[PDB]
Amino acid sequence: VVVAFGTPEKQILIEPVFAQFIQAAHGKVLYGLDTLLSNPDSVAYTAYPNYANVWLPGWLDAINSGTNSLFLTI
Amino acid sequence: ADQSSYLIKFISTAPVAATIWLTITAGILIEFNRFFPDLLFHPLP
Amino acid sequence: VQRGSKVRILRPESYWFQDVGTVASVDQSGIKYPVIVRFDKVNYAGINTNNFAVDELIEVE
Amino acid sequence: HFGHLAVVTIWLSGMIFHGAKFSNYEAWLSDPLNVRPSAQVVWPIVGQDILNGDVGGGFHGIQITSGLFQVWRGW
Amino acid sequence: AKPPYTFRTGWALLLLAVNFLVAAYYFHIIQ
Amino acid sequence: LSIVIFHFSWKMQSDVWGTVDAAGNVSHITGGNFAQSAITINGWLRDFLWAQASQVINSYGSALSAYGLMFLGAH
Amino acid sequence: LGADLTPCAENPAFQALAKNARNTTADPQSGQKRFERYSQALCGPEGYPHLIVDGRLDRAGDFLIPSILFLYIAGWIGWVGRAYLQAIKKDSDTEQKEIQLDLGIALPIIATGFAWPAAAVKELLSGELTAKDSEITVSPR
Amino acid sequence: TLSGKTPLFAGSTGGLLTKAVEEEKYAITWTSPKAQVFELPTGGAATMHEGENLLYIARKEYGIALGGQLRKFKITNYKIYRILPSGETTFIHPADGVFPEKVNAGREKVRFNARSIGENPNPSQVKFSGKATYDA
Amino acid sequence: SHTVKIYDTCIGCTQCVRACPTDVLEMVPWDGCKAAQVASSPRTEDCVGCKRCETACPTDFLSIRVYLGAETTRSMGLAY
Numbered sequence: 203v204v205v206a207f208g209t210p211e212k213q214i215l216i217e218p219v220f221a222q223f224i225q226a227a228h229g230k231v232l233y234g235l236d237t238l239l240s241n242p243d244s245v246a247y248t249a250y251p252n253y254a255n256v257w258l259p260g261w262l263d264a265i266n267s268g269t270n271s272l273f274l275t276i
Numbered sequence: 277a278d279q280s281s282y283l284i285k286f287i288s289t290a291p292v293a294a295t296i297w298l299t300i301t302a303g304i305l306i307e308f309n310r311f312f313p314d315l316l317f318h319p320l321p
Numbered sequence: 322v323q324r325g326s327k328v329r330i331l332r333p334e335s336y337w338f339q340d341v342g343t344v345a346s347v348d349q350s351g352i353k354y355p356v357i358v359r360f361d362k363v364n365y366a367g368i369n370t371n372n373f374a375v376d377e378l379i380e381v382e
Numbered sequence: 383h384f385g386h387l388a389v390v391t392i393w394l395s396g397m398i399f400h401g402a403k404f405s406n407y408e409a410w411l412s413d414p415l416n417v418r419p420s421a422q423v424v425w426p427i428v429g430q431d432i433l434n435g436d437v438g439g440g441f442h443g444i445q446i447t448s449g450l451f452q453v454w455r456g457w
Numbered sequence: 458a459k460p461p462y463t464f465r466t467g468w469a470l471l472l473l474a475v476n477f478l479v480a481a482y483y484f485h486i487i488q
Numbered sequence: 489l490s491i492v493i494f495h496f497s498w499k500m501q502s503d504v505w506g507t508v509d510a511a512g513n514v515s516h517i518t519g520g521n522f523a524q525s526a527i528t529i530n531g532w533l534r535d536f537l538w539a540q541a542s543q544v545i546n547s548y549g550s551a552l553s554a555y556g557l558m559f560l561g562a563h
Numbered sequence: 564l565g566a567d568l569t570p571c572a573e574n575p576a577f578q579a580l581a582k583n584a585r586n587t588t589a590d591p592q593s594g595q596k597r598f599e600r601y602s603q604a605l606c607g608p609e610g611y612p613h614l615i616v617d618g619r620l621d622r623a624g625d626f627l628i629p630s631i632l633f634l635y636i637a638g639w640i641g642w643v644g645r646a647y648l649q650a651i652k653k654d655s656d657t658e659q660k661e662i663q664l665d666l667g668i669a670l671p672i673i674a675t676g677f678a679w680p681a682a683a684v685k686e687l688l689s690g691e692l693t694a695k696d697s698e699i700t701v702s703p704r
Numbered sequence: 705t706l707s708g709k710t711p712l713f714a715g716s717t718g719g720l721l722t723k724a725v726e727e728e729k730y731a732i733t734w735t736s737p738k739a740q741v742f743e744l745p746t747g748g749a750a751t752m753h754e755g756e757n758l759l760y761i762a763r764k765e766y767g768i769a770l771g772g773q774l775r776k777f778k779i780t781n782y783k784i785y786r787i788l789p790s791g792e793t794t795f796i797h798p799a800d801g802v803f804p805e806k807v808n809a810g811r812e813k814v815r816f817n818a819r820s821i822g823e824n825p826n827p828s829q830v831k832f833s834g835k836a837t838y839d840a
Numbered sequence: 841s842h843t844v845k846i847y848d849t850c851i852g853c854t855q856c857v858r859a860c861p862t863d864v865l866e867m868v869p870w871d872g873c874k875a876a877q878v879a880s881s882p883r884t885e886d887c888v889g890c891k892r893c894e895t896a897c898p899t900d901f902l903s904i905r906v907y908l909g910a911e912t913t914r915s916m917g918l919a920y
């Protein structure tokens with residue numbers, strides 16, 4: 203109704219902040235939350251006692267390129 | 277007036293009380309949106 | 322089970338299972354379902370009476 | 383039947399009253415080919431005064447399609 | 458039985474605490 | 489009756505209604521497409537329901553926006 | 564927060580939409596005052612205000628204030644309807660009083676409905692809010 | 705076999721088909737105090753005779769609908785027969801001589817269960833046994 | 841044919857016998873109710889399965905039940 207009446211700014215537009223948090227918890231820098239794998243100082247990023255998260259550079263390379271369907275922006 | 281008691285029992289029936297009450301509610305909402313339009317959110321100080 | 326005593330149904334198939342009814346009359350002929358019970362709620366057929374046994378009732382006081 | 387004829391007559395006299403008060407009928411008589419027939423001005427409340435479109439004759443409202451204008455010109 | 462309901466509310470408080478933990482990571486209280 | 493009024497709409501727009509030039513030739517609204525398109529169900533779906541409903545779906549933000557709203561709410 | 568949200572004052576698309584602003588009501592400045600109200604919200608890249616409902620007090624007016632207001636009004640309505648149904652079951656013509664309201668019973672109930680949270684807490688702690696599972700009907704299993 | 709006069713109607717296409725000659729056929733007989741018009745179960749109007757009447761029909765339900773109609777004409781002596789293609793005529797309604805709404809002695813309980821219906825066993829208790837839950 | 845069975849909560853009000861369009865049901869002597877009569881279904885081969893008897897029954901859930909079974913010319917109600 204509000205877009206029909208020429209006023210699309212009156213829409214109720216709700217960000218999906220929880221699933222965006224989960225994407226930011228996976229290293230997606232686009233939202234700017236600076237949490238678990240998007241925070242380089244985090245214990246989940248470094249894997250502090252062992253440093254054995256070998257998967258993580260290729261994973262962040264895949265999730266932070268916007269050219270695939272790996273955690274699409276919502 | 278005994279007919280006035282009949283009219284009061286008529287107004288108190290479900291469709292008539294419904295149309296009066298929902299007309300009052302819709303009128304309150306319509307008048308509030310006339311005087312204060314476009315309230316997407318409550319504005320904060 | 323006395324006439325005019327509020328009872329509760331223990332027949333599971335009934336419309337008024339675990340619901341309060343009122344005893345209308347009790348037959349002394351030795352029949353299996355003697356107690357005539359009346360209800361304020363009607364069932365899906367539009368009927369508010371049924372015959373019950375004494376075992377299918379508990380008194381509500 | 384009498385009550386129903388009363389309903390239909392209220393409807394008919396209401397359409398004629400909207401043509402009287404809320405229409406561009408006199409502007410339509412002066413130029414029938416370039417003025418679109420319109421009664422029913424819409425109140426402005428929630429942005430719905432977009433529906434009061436430029437129908438011509440210096441008038442804004444909903445363009446009607448029942449042909450009351452042609453009936454009245456033929457009257 | 459169990460008027461304090463101590464077993465089912467232990468797991469409910471545990472799930473609610475895991476929920477507050479994820480929310481504490483959400484609002485950047487714990488980083 | 490839905491097929492009756494669809495026949496009327498597309499036949500009158502395709503073969504009758506339209507503009508007349510000073511030379512006298514008639515250019516119709518949908519351009520005479522009834523003869524070859526209305527003989528298939530695909531032609532109805534495409535050149536009548538898809539093509540002529542462009543005006544009710546592209547009508548948000550215009551004075552015809554209530555008809556787009558009624559189109560969706562009727563669906 | 565997420566997916567390119569800026570404040571509406573800093574966004575060029577919001578200020579582009581603010582110039583061509585339709586008037587919602589009869590006064591000529593409704594379209595300007597609309598964007599002047601919405602300027603404090605966050606803004607998507609297309610220019611529209613996006614609400615944030617996660618629960619922070621920076622954006623409490625987006626969802627938290629309508630939440631408390633709705634829950635108060637809806638609890639009023641449901642509480643008053645419950646109290647009226649419980650009021651008329653003692654009158655032995657209860658079905659007639661549902662299609663034909665008693666105003667003399669209903670109007671004090673709708674007047675006393677401002678204290679529905681206090682009354683609901685007092686009925687929950689007393690145990691009169693619910694019925695027992697053996698006292699209400701169920702189907703054969 | 706059956707004595708009676710066919711009621712007066714000019715024929716319908718709603719009458720009895722090839723099932724009558726190949727499978728089974730029904731007849732209804734009644735007597736009337738006077739000649740009057742009734743409605744056929746096949747559709748249409750027909751005049752019954754003053755005296756004995758006979759009207760062959762395709763289904764038994766036609767005869768019981770007609771016998772329910774004949775009660776409005778205060779006629780309660782109607783009989784329904786079942787006729788096979790061999791010519792075997794059997795008397796089915798009312799079979800006992802008394803209508804089934806009245807209790808007559810000599811009738812036995814058929815398919816009576818001496819329990820309430822909520823006391824039937826579960827389907828899984830009777831599984832692979834060849835019996836129904838409502839049996840006995 | 842269909843199976844029509846009568847349970848012991850019968851009160852003998854004879855309404856199922858009156859409702860039946862194909863004469864399946866009859867009333868027999870009994871002693872378990874005040875009216876001293878149950879319904880009985882000897883002609884279940886005439887039963888079409890229309891359940892007017894279950895519509896007519898006044899007891900809370902059905903002293904009489906029709907269980908739809910195999911189909912014949914009579915139970916399907918064919919005039920052909």
Ligand code: CLA
Binds near residue numbers: 556557558560561563
């Ligand atoms: C809760 C269940 C649900 C809902 C919400 C929907 C929603 C929808 N279905 Mg649907 N559907 C469902 C279940 C559901 N489906 C199921 C289970 C099936 C079976 C598989 C289908 C089968 C199905 C089919 C076959 C179709 C839909 C269609 C639609 C759409 C038409 C509505 C529309 O565009 O918005 C409505 C938009 C509006 C703008 C309406 C506003 C109208 C006015 C202006 C406002 C009204 C408010 C006012 C107070 C009312 C007037 C009161 C008046 C009397 C005074 C919509 C997306 C249809 C469609 O459009 O397909 C393309 C369609 O034809 N669905």
Ligand code: CLA
Binds near residue numbers: 218219222631
């Ligand atoms: C029964 C209702 C219900 C259901 C099934 C869902 C289901 C879903 N929501 Mg959700 N949501 C709901 C209500 C519900 N929501 C409400 C009331 C809000 C507030 C506006 C939200 C806000 C919300 C956001 C912001 C997001 C989701 C998302 C999602 C999806 C992922 C799971 C998730 O994040 O859950 C979230 C669910 C909750 C936080 C609430 C659970 C429902 C509660 C327990 C019911 C009672 C709520 C109560 C009325 C709130 C009163 C408010 C007051 C106290 C202030 C999933 C489809 C995410 C998404 O888009 O995924 C792609 C996402 O980011 N939801």
Ligand code: CLA
Binds near residue numbers: 203306389424426558
């Ligand atoms: C949530 C948003 C919202 C809101 C608040 C409104 C609100 C309103 N709209 Mg609206 N509208 C909306 C969305 C909304 N609309 C949408 C989404 C669209 C696009 C589809 C429109 C399109 C629209 C139009 C096109 C019009 C309105 C109109 C109206 C106004 C009056 C309603 C009316 O005509 O009553 C009608 C009331 C009557 C006709 C009178 C009531 C009947 C009386 C009670 C008598 C009937 C019974 C009686 C017994 C009969 C007598 C018989 C005899 C025997 C006794 C009202 C302010 C109208 C307007 O602006 O008015 C000028 C109008 O013309 N709206």
Ligand code: CLA
Binds near residue numbers: 421446447448555
């Ligand atoms: C909702 C507001 C509203 C109202 C009051 C009207 C009123 C009218 N319009 Mg209009 N119109 C509207 C919206 C509205 N329109 C919209 C959105 C559009 C699209 C832009 C149009 C497009 C339009 C055109 C193109 C034309 C009209 C015409 C008319 C007139 C014809 C009378 C009529 O409605 O038929 C009478 C209708 C009925 C008898 C059936 C309606 C059924 C009931 C009575 C309505 C619902 C009542 C109630 C709210 C429902 C709840 C009750 C229920 C639960 C029991 C009248 C002035 C015509 C005219 O001649 O103009 C003067 C005309 O040509 N209108």
Ligand code: CLA
Binds near residue numbers: 640641642645664
């Ligand atoms: C007294 C009013 C009242 C109250 C307190 C409730 C309470 C409840 N209903 Mg509800 N209900 C009502 C009326 C009411 N109902 C009516 C009239 C209908 C028919 C439309 C329903 C249909 C309904 C369904 C289909 C469902 C519920 C459910 C529920 C439960 C969850 C809350 C909910 O879904 O609400 C939302 C209820 C609705 C949207 C229905 C319409 C509510 C109307 C608008 C309010 C009635 C106002 C009342 C008549 C005013 C009386 C005032 C008096 C002084 C005269 C809750 C126990 C749900 C449930 O079982 O959850 C466990 C569920 O699935 N109800």
Ligand SMILES: CC1=C(/C=C/C(C)=C/C=C/C(C)=C\C=C\C=C(C)\C=C\C=C(C)\C=C\C2=C(C)CCCC2(C)C)C(C)(C)CCC1
Binds near residue numbers: 640
């Ligand atoms: C904070 C927040 C949030 C969250 C929330 C949640 C998550 C919650 C939950 C909640 C829950 C999970 C709840 C539950 C509940 C349960 C129950 C149990 C209840 C019930 C109730 C009742 C019972 C009611 C009653 C009543 C009343 C009160 C009034 C009216 C009437 C009636 C009766 C209805 C969100 C994120 C959204 C948003 C932001 C903020």
Ligand code: SF4
Binds near residue numbers: 864886887888893894
């Ligand atoms: S199903 Fe029909 S034919 Fe069979 S006993 Fe019931 S009413 Fe009679």
